[PDB]
Design a protein around this nucleic acid. Structure first.
Lengths: 108, 212, 212, 108, 108, 103
RNA sequence: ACGGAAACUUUCGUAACUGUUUAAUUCUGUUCACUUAUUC
């Protein structure tokens, strides 16, 4: 969760992170809109938000090169299929916040 | 002798406002102070501290007889409605507010929305360069009702001024709709709309006739 | 002859309140008076001193026959329910309260919250400048049940007034829900809600029929 | 614990502490929310709060320059890995309160 | 011990003691909770209470001006380091009670 | 060496006449806790004490444990006495009777 | 073959009745997702 997120994110290619924190201000708000709604209702009701959340990682990976290099390394598409329970869904929401903190720790 | 007047109404927001909340950590997509909500859940609610701090200021500038300087020390004709920590004749307030909670969640998901709030992109021009300081805010969605109940109670002495008390309260409700209710609402963010303005009695002691 | 009436109920906080507790040391993020809690553990609890000091004040202004001036010396019809340090007919009280403890921790951790209390940011306007005195308070979370049990007992003489005693107690329970319970409740912080208002007998001597 | 906290905090760079006690009103409250819960339950149950507590320190070291110079000197990230026992976790909570007292002793 | 506590406390600055006995209702009670525990057990066990007791004095020297002028004159931080024995620790508990009695005689 | 108050404390007590509040604000003077004492019970035979020595130890041993289950002092109905005989041993000084019924 | 021998300062009793850390207070005052631009 947090131990493997400090070495995988550092292993990249060219220095100087071109992707800033301004072009990623959508996928970080959609995942936060699911963690707060999962504790109020059940998991069988939010089946439409999970399907719409997976498509966002596909459209963003076809317009910028700074997106495909992060999904294939962090295995974002793989974690979206293993989830199936309410407790498992809450783990993916906390893992996304860890990749943002260590992203600005080395650059910005 | 002792009655309980409750002004039950529905605050309809025709324009998304923006009130600075506590810690700017409600979302990992912002950078500035969003809007205060509920600590347990995550529903956009408005506190009652911003209602009394705004209704009293806009009302003490028309029903006063002296230039104000400090709070709780201007216009004695309306000091008994809110409260005064200096006058020895009264200390408690007879106008109890309530934190309005968003109760529009029973039909908002049927129309298909994104979430509960949105991120608005703003900037500024220094009149010497192009874009400077790409900041951002988080306003509120349109059409969101609330539960506003103004609790009113008398204390025996409230006898030869009950009819005058309703004139100030009714004039203050329609005056808030013609002004922004929030932070940095000078560009057009607040402007509320009290829908279904009614008043009923729960304890059962004062008759209802001055409904509207 | 001698019965024990316990008014077991669940106080549901529909609005976060703020009661000035002891010393400001429950957190290293505050600066003002927080909320009293537990010296051993760390669970937000409300004492019973604020319940007797508020229920008696709001009730002695409608069931009285003379303008009050000092406590324990006004309205003899309700002085026997709380106590009087001056009347020689009675000294002890027949309404023993209880410090309500938060028992909502059995299901609060399953939802995943941040802590148990939140820090709300507030300030004031001097009507001559912008922001002044950046203070802060600490309120309580929403939806938190409590264990409120009103202990009642008779003393033989309580014979031709038992039916009148339940009328004053029942009227005082519904009256507290229409008013703030705590400190700085003028902006809408208190307003409790007695959920599952029931009464049972433990010793076994008086029949139950006036439940509601 | 308290002996090495009076000399390491004073050794800084530019005078006049720009970081105030208002912008640090979150990471100082989350540590207090863990010390009180460690005495009621065991350590194997609060494994989710430890992972989220570490992300807050890394997230603050990328948004303000007054945080990177404090973590690298006081070794905040190093102490978060050595902990593993209930008694060891309680020592880190008392060490954080010591850095706050000596911070306002010289300035504010 | 009791000789240097009658002349050093009187030597201050502006008259009328602004600090009362209400804003100091913690640091004067935590020292009493250590004198009774030092006579029951040994000194090597109460090593955690000594570290936390020192933080309370430094934390109050930055939130009120009526505390910095009392620690630097009475040398409160200096006496907390010389102690190391059970008999020496009991002397600091009696020295703190002497500064409270004379503080209420001249003022309050 | 431990540093205590003194030797005797003062306790505040009163009574309730079931008609008024506090009545007769009196006070007492109790003793401190944990204070050992020197208690020595001397027993001697007189020749005739022969066919009943073993029976005499049954009454003395039963009387020592019986005093611990009862108050020893004044106004002990609320729980003031209740002693505890620590290190109950018996030895001889003149030397004319062996020790075996120690406990 | 003791101015001695036989003997609870003991029996009885909440330091008690009464009392909101309370009244007063907008996290707001300034701010175009902008500048250059043939779907030919």
């Amino acid at each position: 969760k947090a131990e493997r997120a400090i070495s995988l994110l550092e292993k990249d290619n060219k220095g100087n992170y071109l992707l800033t924190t301004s072009q990623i201000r959508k996928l970080l708000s959609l995942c936060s809109s699911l963690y707060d709604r999962s504790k109020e209702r059940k998991f069988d009701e939010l089946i439409n938000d999970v399907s719409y959340l997976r498509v966002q990682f596909v459209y963003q990976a076809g317009r910028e090169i700074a997106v495909k290099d992060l999904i294939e390394k962090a295995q974002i598409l793989e974690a979206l299929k293993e989830i199936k329970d309410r407790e498992t869904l809450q783990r993916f929401c906390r893992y996304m916040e860890a990749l943002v903190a260590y992203f600005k720790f080395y650059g910005g | 002798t002792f009655a309980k007047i409750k002004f039950s109404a529905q605050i309809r927001l025709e324009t998304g406002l923006h009130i600075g909340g506590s810690d700017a950590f409600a979302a990992i997509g912002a950078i500035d102070s969003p809007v205060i909500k509920d600590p347990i859940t995550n529903i956009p609610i408005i506190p009652g501290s911003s209602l009394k701090g705004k209704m009293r200021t806009l009302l003490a500038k028309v029903y006063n007889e002296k230039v104000a300087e400090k709070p709780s020390d201007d216009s004695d004709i309306l000091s008994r409605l809110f409260g005064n920590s200096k006058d020895k004749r009264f200390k408690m307030g007879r106008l109890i507010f309530r934190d309005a909670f968003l109760s529009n969640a029973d039909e908002l998901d049927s129309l298909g929305v994104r979430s509960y709030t949105e991120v608005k992109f703003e900037n500024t021009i220094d009149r010497i360069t192009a874009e400077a300081n790409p900041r951002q805010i988080e306003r509120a969605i349109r059409n969101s009702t609330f539960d506003f109940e103004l609790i009113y109670e008398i204390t025996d002495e409230n006898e030869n001024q009950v009819e005058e008390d309703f004139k100030v309260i009714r004039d203050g409700l329609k005056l808030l709709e013609l002004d922004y209710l929030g932070g940095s609402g000078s560009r057009g963010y607040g402007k509320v709309a009290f829908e279904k303005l009614k008043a009923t009695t729960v304890f059962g002691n004062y008759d209802v006739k001055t409904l509207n």
